[PDB]
C-alpha cells in the first residue's frame, strides 16, 4: 500500500503561532525533517481516518516571513494550506489577503483553511463579526488555540474531506498531542462557536 500524503504549507504573519501549532502533534515533531536550502522544517502529521491513515507533511518556516514573502520553493507542489492569523492582533488579519495572494500565485486553487489563533486570550480583538475573508474566497474558517489544543483537528479534517472527496470522512481518534499549556474555558468556546454561527447568517 502506497501511503496517502499531502504537502501542506502553513503561512501567516510572524508571531501568529504557526510553529506552536504544528508542534502540538508529538510524532510530527519527533519525525520532523529539516530542509536546509529553504530553512524549513517539514512535520509529518499522521491522522487515522475511517478510511485509513492520511499524512499531512506540514511545512513550517524558520521565521523568514518576518522579513518578506516566502520563496517559490516553499510553496511549490503544495496540495493544501492553512493561513493563520492572531485574533489579538488586527494587523495579522489585515495581512491575510496578502498571504492568500502569494499562495495562489504559486499554487492556484488548492484547498485552504483560515485559522484565527490564540482564542484562549480573554482580550480578543478580531471577533467573529469581523472575520470575513473566507466567506468571499471559498475558504473554511476555524477559531483555534494552539496552546490549548482547541480545535486542533478541525483544519486537517476539513482538508482531508476536500482532498479525498469524502464528506463523511472521520478521524478514528485524535493524534497524541502535547498536553494543553493553558486551559480553554469551555464556556468561552461555546460562545465563540455561537458567535461564528451568528456571523455566518449576516449578509456581507
Amino acid at each position: 500500500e502506497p501511503q496517502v500524503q499531502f504537502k501542506l504549507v502553513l503561512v501567516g504573519d510572524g508571531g501568529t503561532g504557526k510553529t506552536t501549532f504544528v508542534k502540538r502533534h508529538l510524532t510530527g515533531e519527533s519525525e520532523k525533517k529539516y530542509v536546509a536550502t529553504l530553512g524549513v522544517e517539514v512535520h509529518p502529521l499522521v491522522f487515522h481516518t475511517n478510511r485509513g491513515p492520511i499524512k499531512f507533511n506540514v511545512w513550517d518556516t524558520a521565521g523568514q516571513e518576518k522579513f518578506g514573502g516566502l520563496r517559490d520553493g516553499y510553496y511549490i507542489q503544495a496540495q493544501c494550506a492553512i493561513i493563520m492569523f492572531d485574533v489579538t492582533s488586527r494587523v495579522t488579519y489585515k495581512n491575510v489577503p496578502n498571504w492568500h495572494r502569494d499562495l495562489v500565485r504559486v499554487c492556484e486553487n488548492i484547498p485552504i483553511v483560515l485559522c484565527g489563533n490564540k482564542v484562549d486570550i480573554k482580550d480578543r480583538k478580531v471577533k467573529a463579526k469581523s472575520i470575513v475573508f473566507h466567506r468571499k474566497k471559498n475558504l473554511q474558517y476555524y477559531d483555534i488555540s494552539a496552546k490549548s489544543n482547541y480545535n486542533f483537528e478541525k483544519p486537517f479534517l476539513w482538508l482531508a474531506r476536500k482532498l479525498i472527496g469524502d464528506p463523511n470522512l472521520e478521524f478514528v481518534a485524535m493524534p497524541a498531542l502535547a498536553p494543553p499549556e493553558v486551559v480553554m474555558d469551555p464556556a468561552l468556546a461555546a460562545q465563540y462557536e455561537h458567535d461564528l454561527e451568528v456571523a455566518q447568517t449576516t449578509a456581507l
Binding site: 504537502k7 530542509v35 536550502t37 529553504l38 524549513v40 511549490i76
Partner: peptide, 27 residues
Amino acid sequence: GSWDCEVCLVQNKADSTKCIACESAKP
C-alpha cells in the same frame, strides 16, 4: 519513474534530476 525527495518529501517527475522544491539531488 516519479521519486519522493528524501529531504523534503515532495514528489518529483522522472524528468527532474533535482527536487523542484528544495533543489536536492535524486538518489
